[PDB]
């Protein structure tokens, strides 16, 4: 992708995470566990169902349309009917296609762009307790309890408490 | 036959909310758009990378 | 949003039913819905959820193996269907929003009701 | 289960509360949301995340949370305020679940 996290420095999925599109996973001595972030996966939600209901939107419903006779002495007329036809189905045709081809790319740097904010987002609280490994982890210096693990997955992790 | 509809072609009825079909030009009701496309597949997820 | 149900129904003890709920908006949405029970002279009961992309439905543990929700998308409708109807699954069924995504506690725009009488 | 007083009764102009108990299952790990019916019509929203409000609600209603148990209440008692109250909380441990409360008949003189 054009922000290099989802299938770079981060390498892989979690079949483990059911509830949410990006989260987060933990562990210390009470036990281990993932938590997906809710806040980054309605917003994803939102923007993506209004691309789709505008997509929806940029078409309207087709009407009753049938074809015409001509006789042995009207072929001109035959051949310009065809001719509008078939002009207006191609012209179609490769509006859509081409609407589906450059929407796909966009949603997919979409979500590459929400993972590399998120990660971000955590390693600018965490600046100086906790080491940065390489796999979108982070190793703590001191003790983190459930308290501290809720409060880092929350964006009020108080840094002067821990040094 | 006996049935009802709201979109007739040439070839059979039609039973759809989508917004296209590729199945003839000739439409009688409240039909959707003719495209002569075979795969229209809009993505809303990300990309599947599993097993890691 | 406005939330519709569909006509009130009359049926008679082991058939099975099936109701549907209409919103007003774009076709695709970003919130859950549920359907909430209420029989006449006690409070109000939940049955189940259904989430809008990913598709996961939840289901009261009463009503586990009976109720059945499926969701349309491109139309804006979601069903209901109960089966194997006892005589006590006469009461008023409602359709409520939830906010966000998620099944939770909070719904805070309900449908208007419709009875179904098992005789 | 939440249980409820099942019945109220005050005069008007008078301040009156509604205690919603539950267990440590449901009451003490997650928030408590307050609904209001009126006869004949769809339960309405007045509480939600413990004691926030939407818009379009008055200040005459509050709520808050007090360790296993949570309370309603009205100040500002008039007769539009005729219902019945109930308490929600989103179960979770066996088969998460919501769970509605019992009933509260808050009769106002």
């Known amino acids: 992708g054009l922000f290099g996290a989802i299938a770079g420095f981060i390498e892989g999925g979690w079949t483990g995470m059911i509830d949410g599109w990006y989260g987060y996973h933990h562990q210390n001595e009470q036990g281990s566990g993932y938590a997906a972030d809710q806040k980054s996966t309605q917003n994803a939600i939102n923007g993506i169902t209004n691309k789709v209901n505008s997509v929806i939107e940029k078409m309207n419903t087709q009407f009753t349309a049938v074809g015409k006779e001509f006789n042995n002495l009207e072929k001109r007329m035959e051949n310009l009917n065809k001719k509008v036809d078939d002009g207006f189905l191609d012209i179609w045709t490769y509006n859509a296609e081409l609407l589906v081809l450059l929407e796909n790319e966009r949603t997919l740097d979409f979500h590459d762009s929400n993972v590399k904010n998120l990660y971000e987002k955590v390693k600018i609280q965490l600046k100086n307790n906790a080491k940065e490994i390489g796999n979108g982890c982070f190793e703590f210096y001191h003790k983190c309890d459930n308290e501290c693990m809720e409060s880092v997955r929350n964006g009020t992790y108080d840094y002067p408490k821990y040094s | 036959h006996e049935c009802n509809t709201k979109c007739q072609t040439p070839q059979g009825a039609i039973n759809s909310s989508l917004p296209f079909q590729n199945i003839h030009p000739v439409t009688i009701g409240e039909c959707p758009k003719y495209v002569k496309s075979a795969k229209l597949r809009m993505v809303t997820g990300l990309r599947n990378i599993p097993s890691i | 949003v406005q939330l519709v149900e569909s006509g009130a129904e009359v049926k008679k003890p082991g058939s099975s039913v099936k109701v549907s709920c209409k919103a007003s908006g774009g076709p695709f949405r970003s919130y859950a819905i549920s359907w909430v029970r209420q029989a006449p002279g006690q409070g109000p009961e939940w049955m189940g959820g259904i989430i809008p992309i990913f598709g996961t439905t939840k289901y009261a543990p009463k009503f586990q193996g009976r109720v059945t929700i499926t969701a349309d998308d491109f139309a804006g409708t979601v069903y209901m269907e109960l089966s194997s109807l006892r005589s006590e699954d006469t009461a008023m069924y409602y359709c409520?929003?939830?906010?966000?995504?998620?099944?939770?506690?909070?719904?805070?725009?309900w449908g208007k009701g419709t009875t179904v009488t098992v005789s | 289960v939440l249980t409820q007083p099942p019945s109220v009764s005050a005069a008007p102009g008078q301040k009156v509360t509604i205690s919603c108990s539950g267990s440590?299952?449901?009451?003490?790990?997650?928030?408590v949301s307050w609904y209001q019916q009126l006869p004949g019509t769809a339960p309405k929203l007045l509480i939600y995340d413990n004691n926030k409000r939407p818009s379009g609600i008055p200040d005459r209603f509050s709520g808050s949370k007090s360790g296993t148990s949570a309370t309603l209440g009205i100040t500002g008692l008039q007769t539009g305020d005729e219902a019945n109250y109930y308490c929600?909380?989103?179960?979770?441990?066996?088969?998460?679940?919501?769970?509605f409360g019992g009933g509260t008949k808050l009769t106002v003189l």
């Open positions: 929600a909380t989103w179960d979770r441990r066996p088969t998460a679940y919501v769970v």
């Open positions: 409520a929003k939830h906010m966000g995504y998620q099944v939770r506690e909070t719904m805070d725009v």
């Open positions: 440590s299952s449901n009451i003490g790990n997650d928030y």
